Design a protein around this motif. Structure first.
Motif, PDB file in Angstrom:
ATOM      1  N   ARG I  21       0.887  -1.318   0.137  1.00 45.88           N
ATOM      2  CA  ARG I  21       0.235  -0.073   0.237  1.00 45.88           C
ATOM      3  C   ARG I  21       0.899   1.436  -0.092  1.00 45.88           C
ATOM      4  N   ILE I  22       2.059   1.328   0.818  1.00 41.46           N
ATOM      5  CA  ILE I  22       2.817   2.364   0.825  1.00 41.46           C
ATOM      6  C   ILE I  22       3.496   2.430  -0.603  1.00 41.46           C
ATOM      7  N   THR I  23       3.859   1.425  -1.309  1.00 36.95           N
ATOM      8  CA  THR I  23       4.257   1.505  -2.600  1.00 36.95           C
ATOM      9  C   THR I  23       3.456   2.400  -3.755  1.00 36.95           C
ATOM     10  N   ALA I  24       2.115   1.715  -3.403  1.00 31.28           N
ATOM     11  CA  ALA I  24       1.181   2.333  -4.262  1.00 31.28           C
ATOM     12  C   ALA I  24       1.209   4.005  -4.221  1.00 31.28           C
ATOM     13  N   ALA I  25       1.033   4.301  -2.961  1.00 31.31           N
ATOM     14  CA  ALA I  25       0.741   5.622  -2.370  1.00 31.31           C
ATOM     15  C   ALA I  25       2.071   6.387  -3.013  1.00 31.31           C
ATOM     16  N   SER I  26       3.209   5.795  -2.777  1.00 33.13           N
ATOM     17  CA  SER I  26       4.440   6.807  -3.238  1.00 33.13           C
ATOM     18  C   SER I  26       4.661   6.732  -4.670  1.00 33.13           C
ATOM     19  N   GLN I  27       4.002   5.812  -5.408  1.00 32.96           N
ATOM     20  CA  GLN I  27       4.126   5.789  -6.814  1.00 32.96           C
ATOM     21  C   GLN I  27       3.408   6.904  -7.421  1.00 32.96           C
ATOM     22  N   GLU I  28       2.120   7.270  -6.945  1.00 28.47           N
ATOM     23  CA  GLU I  28       1.277   8.537  -7.384  1.00 28.47           C
ATOM     24  C   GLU I  28       1.985   9.472  -7.151  1.00 28.47           C
ATOM     25  N   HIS I  29       3.032   9.618  -6.559  1.00 28.90           N
ATOM     26  CA  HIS I  29       3.876  11.099  -6.262  1.00 28.90           C
ATOM     27  C   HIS I  29       5.167  10.803  -7.104  1.00 28.90           C
ATOM     28  N   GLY I  30       5.527   9.835  -7.843  1.00 23.51           N
ATOM     29  CA  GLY I  30       6.742   9.617  -8.545  1.00 23.51           C
ATOM     30  C   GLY I  30       7.802   9.300  -7.607  1.00 23.51           C
ATOM     31  N   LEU I  31       7.506   8.583  -6.671  1.00 27.84           N
ATOM     32  CA  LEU I  31       8.613   7.952  -5.650  1.00 27.84           C
ATOM     33  C   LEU I  31       8.595   6.422  -5.601  1.00 27.84           C
ATOM     34  N   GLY I  38      13.479   5.311   3.336  1.00 25.72           N
ATOM     35  CA  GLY I  38      14.848   5.671   3.500  1.00 25.72           C
ATOM     36  C   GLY I  38      14.874   7.079   4.003  1.00 25.72           C
ATOM     37  N   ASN I  39      14.673   8.069   3.122  1.00 25.54           N
ATOM     38  CA  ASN I  39      14.876   9.531   3.363  1.00 25.54           C
ATOM     39  C   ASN I  39      13.965  10.020   4.631  1.00 25.54           C
ATOM     40  N   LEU I  40      12.763   9.259   4.798  1.00 26.58           N
ATOM     41  CA  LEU I  40      12.138   9.756   6.093  1.00 26.58           C
ATOM     42  C   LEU I  40      12.772   9.476   7.281  1.00 26.58           C
ATOM     43  N   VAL I  41      13.684   8.366   7.357  1.00 25.31           N
ATOM     44  CA  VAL I  41      14.267   8.156   8.537  1.00 25.31           C
ATOM     45  C   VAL I  41      15.600   9.209   8.644  1.00 25.31           C
ATOM     46  N   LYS I  42      15.967   9.696   7.460  1.00 19.96           N
ATOM     47  CA  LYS I  42      16.917  10.631   7.340  1.00 19.96           C
ATOM     48  C   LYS I  42      16.523  11.855   7.963  1.00 19.96           C
ATOM     49  N   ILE I  57      -4.289   6.201   2.904  1.00 15.32           N
ATOM     50  CA  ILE I  57      -5.571   5.983   2.700  1.00 15.32           C
ATOM     51  C   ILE I  57      -6.317   6.985   3.132  1.00 15.32           C
ATOM     52  N   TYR I  58      -6.344   7.555   4.519  1.00 10.67           N
ATOM     53  CA  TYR I  58      -7.299   8.395   5.003  1.00 10.67           C
ATOM     54  C   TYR I  58      -6.817   9.585   5.156  1.00 10.67           C
ATOM     55  N   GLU I  59      -5.409  10.095   4.831  1.00  7.44           N
ATOM     56  CA  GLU I  59      -4.843  11.501   5.230  1.00  7.44           C
ATOM     57  C   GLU I  59      -3.947  11.431   3.854  1.00  7.44           C
ATOM     58  N   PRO I  60      -4.692  11.736   2.849  1.00  5.80           N
ATOM     59  CA  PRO I  60      -3.673  11.962   1.563  1.00  5.80           C
ATOM     60  C   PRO I  60      -2.964  12.977   1.234  1.00  5.80           C
ATOM     61  N   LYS I  61      -3.492  14.177   1.971  1.00  3.48           N
ATOM     62  CA  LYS I  61      -2.631  15.383   1.813  1.00  3.48           C
ATOM     63  C   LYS I  61      -1.414  15.674   2.970  1.00  3.48           C
ATOM     64  N   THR I  62      -1.744  14.804   3.879  1.00  2.00           N
ATOM     65  CA  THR I  62      -0.479  14.615   4.950  1.00  2.00           C
ATOM     66  C   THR I  62       0.665  13.585   4.129  1.00  2.00           C
ATOM     67  N   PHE I  63       0.107  12.692   3.596  1.00  2.00           N
ATOM     68  CA  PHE I  63       0.978  11.643   2.936  1.00  2.00           C
ATOM     69  C   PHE I  63       1.710  12.223   1.724  1.00  2.00           C
ATOM     70  N   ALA I  68       6.919  14.772  -0.267  1.00  2.38           N
ATOM     71  CA  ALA I  68       7.475  15.943  -0.572  1.00  2.38           C
ATOM     72  C   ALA I  68       8.448  16.011   0.104  1.00  2.38           C
ATOM     73  N   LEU I  69       8.186  15.648   1.487  1.00  2.00           N
ATOM     74  CA  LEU I  69       9.640  15.871   2.426  1.00  2.00           C
ATOM     75  C   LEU I  69      10.883  14.774   2.081  1.00  2.00           C
ATOM     76  N   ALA I  70      10.255  13.491   1.754  1.00  2.00           N
ATOM     77  CA  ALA I  70      11.286  12.498   1.621  1.00  2.00           C
ATOM     78  C   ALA I  70      11.973  12.891   0.099  1.00  2.00           C
ATOM     79  N   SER I  71      11.252  13.652  -0.756  1.00  2.64           N
ATOM     80  CA  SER I  71      11.650  13.880  -2.143  1.00  2.64           C
ATOM     81  C   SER I  71      12.858  15.218  -1.883  1.00  2.64           C
TER      82      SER I  71
END
Ligand code: FES
Ligand SMILES: [K+]
Ligand SMILES: [K+]
Ligand SMILES: [Mg+2]
Ligand SMILES: [Mg+2]
Ligand SMILES: [Mg+2]
Ligand SMILES: [Mg+2]
Ligand SMILES: [Mg+2]
Ligand SMILES: [Mg+2]
Ligand SMILES: [Mg+2]
Ligand SMILES: [Mg+2]
Ligand SMILES: [Mg+2]
Ligand SMILES: [Mg+2]
Ligand SMILES: [Mg+2]
Ligand SMILES: [Zn+2]
Lengths: 162, 40, 100, 177, 38, 38, 174, 161, 99
Positions: I21-31, I38-42, I57-63, I68-71
């Motif tokens: 599910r995270i993979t799907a959500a990340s791909q929607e933003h090109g990540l 990895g970058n969230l940990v950093k 699923i429930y907070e798509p703007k926060t995601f 964006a932060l990870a990117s």
RNA sequence: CUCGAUGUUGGAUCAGGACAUCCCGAUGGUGCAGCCGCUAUUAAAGGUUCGUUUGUUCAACGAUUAAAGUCCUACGUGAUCU
């Protein structure tokens, strides 16, 4: 370059040769110490089969390769370009460098199959009827091993066998 | 994920190790009084 | 002009750090669809002497043809449409739990 | 979103229709993209038992391109079940016989090996040429980017691009060429 | 044509050519010199 | 089992295979190919 | 339209009357089968576009049968055609230039002496038959001790595969 | 007009990814202060509706909002009805903004309170061992203590500077 | 016995689900998934995969902000790696030290 | 592995498969003139006899054939037979 013209008038043929316009290498190469055109412009390891602007400078009007003594390429680069040109022809990227056809010859219609990175000539390859076990699998080569040292921008190296 | 990076910052490879995320109290009484220390 | 992600689909993300550097603040207002990017809703869909009555065009279909129609309509395989036996029908929970 | 419960559920689990152009694209990369969509693995709400796959429409499957010599080397084998029924055909032979078979088989092999696979295949719409039925065209939502960038032929380069590339060597003036 | 694992030119008129993906020895003077890579 | 000296090349223990793989000769590579310099 | 190379015309439906000898002028005897065209009419024309195949088709019917024994859908079909129902209907692949209007009668003189024809019909029904009659198997000897084994298939497969190949010749309807 | 390291344009002359130019740190520090001030004013003026938070509690993380229930897998030594504060908040989010800890948010910034509403035990959990042909079989049933918490309120203070 | 051993698989499958599910959500933003985690940990963001899947699923703007932060942190990494040490640390690359 | 049983030769019946091809097809070489051969490449769609003695598989012999192929299938096949 030099053109050879045959003009037959009556019973007498006349063979002559004329010097046409010749292109000149662009001025101020970035690496004058370079020993061949490729490394004089820092192009070593940085071109592929689809770089027709590069490849087309080293081929004859009918698609054939030019001698290494004339171009000045080193053996290594000359062989890379030679393989790249074969792949460019097979991919259909050189539509104005087709073989010369004698008068009265019109090739028959042949099935069109789009292909790229084609190492071998299509007619010389047999089907892989027996794939073999996972530990001794018969592979389908893709690309050329001559380009194995090309700059790789991905963490995975080029896969030359599929 | 991130184990090697955390080690490079002088942190535990696992974020469940030492640090405020694990060691600090989980809760306190709503009136301010601190909770008894956690067993772990 | 640098933006980590395109700002044109979901929300306008603005990332910032507090002066101390201990908190990341994310301002993400929603982007509304522009009016120009919408279509108009398709509202648009004889001296007869006899009152026009409802005509039943629901001709009964045999199982085979019926299942083909349903499978094509919903892009499924035929299997889902066939019945199941009493053993399975009576095992199904008819008052399942409901969260919200 | 403040929707009613039933409309909210309908929206989240809706079936999207995707368009993919196979011209000059390797079938495998097309299949990798289609497999994800047909399964629903591109949705954060994905679950195996949610039946949340989407529709994938692939056009120009007749104009796929294999790398290497796969046209000659890749073999598709089947067996009728009768004695002597083993059949092996090259990719080239199969392609001229069935202009959608190659892409279809690549996708079929990538989907999960379970009873949902054939249901997912019902949501795949393969067309050998640019023509797409009108109904299918009307339900399309988004076209997916082609996975392979098509290289330009030498005759497609603009004179600006040709002039920008330097001449690398000086041929002898007396060479016949 | 005799199949050979090691191709050898048997006279000055033998010439090596690679055709249909394999090497051959052809000889017009002595056709018996013809060899096919195995 | 087979003896320490065999007519065929005996299969190695996987750990030994890895040892060999990790200890292969690596030739010195020059920054610029010497043929590309005067 | 006039005949052109590559044109395929309609065929006929006929009843098999029997067989008869004839002799040729060289003295050779040839047996022939008499085929009588009995109430043969064109019934339907389907264009190349709607046929689902490469060619247009023309439906022909033969031999009048009782209307009291046919399904209602068939009877209304024949009612609109204005013909009595036919026992057998067959589909003939034709080229567009050979189309004939439904309801046209067809006659034996559609064919001419010297032509060659193909004739398709249901073979005589022999019911359930053993391998000897059905497939021409040799069976087993009559004496020298054979035990209740004279007309049987024998072995049906090899031991290894532990199964019987699809298409294996066995007793069945002939 | 060619520098020493100039390479003619080819498919491999440059990397496939586009070039990214990050903002000037001095200019961005000013932009960050503006964003933080804007979000802080939204808190002062109460321009937010329902809040949610990600809280670390009992080794695991919980995305919670007001009126939620969470089932803790152990006893907590609290009477039913006792109100407590959840002190480990990794994230607090609103419709139009989100605050992220590094890794935890300051206690001045956010306050999450909860109330113990039930102390019970889990349903019986079978623990069965078996090994064929070894006369090896044992059975143990365990019930684990549990605590149900109701999240009462998530409150944020305008302490972003 | 199946019920007993299934407790391991439940945990394993749940995490596989969150990653999908995270993979799907990340791909929607090109990540890609590894770039986000990895970058969230950093950035010292210790959100676990369960919560990250819930946020998608429930907070798509926060995601999207997290994407964006990870990117952003990912681009700062590249800039630093390309530099020779002249550049100061990225704004989002600074680590809060504890003692 | 199987002895609280995996029935042991040859034949009959039906044959599935490999090709290292006996015949039929396509080719290179020849100390290939031709007719016959020898050798190699390619080809497994189709075909590959009947008899006397012997339990025989084989072998010998008679008469044929375009040819009377080599093998695997629990030395195929006994809940089909002998
Ligand atoms: S001498 Fe430099 S690449 Fe050839
Ligand atoms: K035994
Ligand atoms: K005898
Ligand atoms: Mg030993
Ligand atoms: Mg009968
Ligand atoms: Mg008999
Ligand atoms: Mg008896
Ligand atoms: Mg008897
Ligand atoms: Mg794990
Ligand atoms: Mg037993
Ligand atoms: Mg057979
Ligand atoms: Mg052979
Ligand atoms: Mg046996
Ligand atoms: Mg048996
Ligand atoms: Zn010679």
């Amino acid at each position: 370059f030099r053109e050879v013209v045959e003009t037959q008038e009556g019973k007498t043929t006349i063979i002559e040769g004329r010097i046409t316009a010749t292109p000149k290498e662009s001025p101020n190469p970035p690496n004058p110490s370079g020993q061949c055109p490729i490394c004089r412009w820092n192009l070593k390891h940085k071109y592929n089969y689809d770089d027709v602007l590069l490849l087309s400078q080293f081929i004859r009007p009918h698609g054939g390769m030019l001698p290494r003594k004339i171009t000045g390429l080193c053996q290594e680069e000359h062989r890379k370009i030679e393989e790249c040109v074969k792949m460019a022809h097979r991919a259909g990227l050189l539509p104005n460098h087709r073989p010369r056809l004698p008068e009265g010859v019109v090739p028959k219609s042949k099935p069109q199959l789009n292909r790229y990175l084609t190492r071998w000539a299509p007619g010389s390859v047999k089907p892989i009827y027996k794939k073999g076990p996972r530990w001794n699998r018969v592979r389908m080569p893709v690309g050329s091993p001559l380009l194995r040292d090309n700059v790789c921008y991905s963490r995975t190296p080029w896969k030359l066998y599929h | 994920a991130g184990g090697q990076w955390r080690l490079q910052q002088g942190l535990a490879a696992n974020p469940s190790g030492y640090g405020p995320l694990t060691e600090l109290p989980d809760w306190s009484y709503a009136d301010g009084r601190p909770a008894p220390p956690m067993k772990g | 002009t640098y933006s980590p992600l395109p700002d044109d689909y979901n929300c306008n993300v603005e990332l910032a750090l507090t002066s101390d550097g201990r908190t990341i603040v994310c301002y993400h207002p929603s982007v509304d669809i522009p009016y120009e990017h919408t279509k108009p809703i398709p509202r648009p869909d004889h001296d007869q002497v006899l009152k026009t009555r409802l005509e039943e065009k629901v001709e009964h279909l045999e199982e085979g043809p019926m299942i083909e129609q349903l499978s094509k309509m919903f892009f499924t395989t035929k299997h889902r449409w066939y019945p199941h036996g009493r053993y399975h029908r009576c095992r199904k929970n008819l008052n399942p739990p409901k969260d919200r | 979103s403040s929707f009613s419960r039933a409309p909210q559920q309908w929206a989240t689990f809706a079936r999207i229709w995707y368009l993919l152009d196979g011209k000059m694209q390797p079938p495998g990369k097309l299949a990798a993209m289609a497999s994800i969509r047909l399964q629903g693995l591109h949705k954060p709400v994905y679950h195996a038992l949610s039946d949340c796959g989407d529709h994938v429409v692939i056009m120009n499957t007749r104009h796929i391109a294999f790398s290497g010599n796969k046209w000659e080397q890749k073999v598709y084998s089947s067996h009728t079940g009768y004695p002597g029924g083993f059949r092996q055909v090259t990719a080239a032979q199969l392609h001229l016989r069935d202009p959608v078979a190659i892409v279809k088989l690549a996708i079929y092999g990538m989907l999960p090996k379970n009873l949902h696979r054939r249901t997912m295949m019902e949501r795949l719409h393969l067309f050998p040429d640019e023509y797409i039925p009108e109904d299918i065209l009307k339900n399309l939502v988004e076209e997916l980017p082609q996975p392979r960038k098509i290289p330009k032929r030498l005759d497609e380069y603009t004179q600006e691009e040709i002039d920008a590339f330097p001449r690398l060597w000086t041929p002898p003036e007396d060479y016949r060429l | 044509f005799k199949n050979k694992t090691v191709l050898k030119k048997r006279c000055k008129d033998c010439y090596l050519v690679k055709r249909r993906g394999r090497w051959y020895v052809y000889c017009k003077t002595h056709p018996r010199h013809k060899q096919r890579q195995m | 089992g087979s003896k320490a000296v065999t007519r065929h090349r005996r299969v190695m223990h996987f750990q030994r295979q890895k040892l060999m793989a990790v200890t292969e000769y690596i030739p010195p590579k020059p920054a610029i190919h010497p043929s590309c310099l005067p | 339209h006039p005949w052109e190379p590559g044109s395929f015309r309609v065929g006929l439906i006929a009843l098999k009357l029997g067989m008869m000898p004839l002799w040729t002028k060289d003295g050779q005897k040839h047996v022939v089968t008499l085929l009588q065209v009995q109430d043969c009419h064109v019934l339907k024309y389907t264009s190349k576009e709607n046929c689902n195949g490469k060619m247009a088709t023309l439906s022909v019917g033969g031999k009048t049968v009782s209307r009291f024994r046919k399904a209602t859908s068939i009877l209304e079909f024949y009612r609109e055609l204005g013909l009595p129902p036919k026992q057998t209907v067959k589909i003939f692949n034709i080229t567009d230039n050979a189309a004939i209007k439904p309801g046209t009668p067809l006659y034996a003189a559609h064919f001419r002496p010297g032509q060659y024809v193909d004739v398709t019909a249901k073979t005589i029904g022999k019911g359930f038959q053993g391998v000897m009659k059905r497939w021409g198997f040799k069976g087993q000897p009559a004496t020298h001790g054979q035990t209740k084994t004279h007309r049987r298939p024998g072995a049906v497969a090899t031991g290894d595969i532990g199964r019987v190949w699809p298409g294996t010749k066995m007793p069945g309807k002939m | 007009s060619y520098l020493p390291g100039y390479v003619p344009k080819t498919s491999l002359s440059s990397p496939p990814w586009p070039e990214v130019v990050l903002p000037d740190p001095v200019e961005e520090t000013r932009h960050h202060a503006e964003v933080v001030k804007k979000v802080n004013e939204m808190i002062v003026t109460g321009q937010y509706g329902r809040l949610f938070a990600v809280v670390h509690f009992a080794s695991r993380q919980w995305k919670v909002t007001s009126e939620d229930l969470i089932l803790i897998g152990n006893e907590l030594d609290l009477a039913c009805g006792e109100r407590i504060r959840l002190e480990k908040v990794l994230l607090v989010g609103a419709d139009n903004f989100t605050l992220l800890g590094k890794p935890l948010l300051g206690k001045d910034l956010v306050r999450v309170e909860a109330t113990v509403i039930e102390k019970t035990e889990s349903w019986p959990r079978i623990i069965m061992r078996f090994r064929k042909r070894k006369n090896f079989k044992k059975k143990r049933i365990v019930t684990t203590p549990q605590t149900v918490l109701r999240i009462n309120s998530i409150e944020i203070a305008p302490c972003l500077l | 016995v199946k019920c007993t051993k299934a407790r391991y698989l439940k945990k394993k499958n749940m995490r596989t689900l969150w990653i999908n599910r995270i993979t799907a959500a990340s791909q929607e933003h090109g990540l890609k998934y590894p770039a986000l985690i990895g970058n969230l940990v950093k950035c010292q963001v210790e959100l676990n995969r369960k919560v990250l899947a819930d946020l998608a699923i429930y907070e798509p703007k926060t995601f999207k902000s997290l994407a964006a932060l990870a990117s952003r942190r990912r681009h700062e990494g590249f800039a630093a790696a390309l530099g020779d040490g002249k550049e100061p640390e990225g704004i989002f690359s600074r680590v809060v030290q504890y003692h």
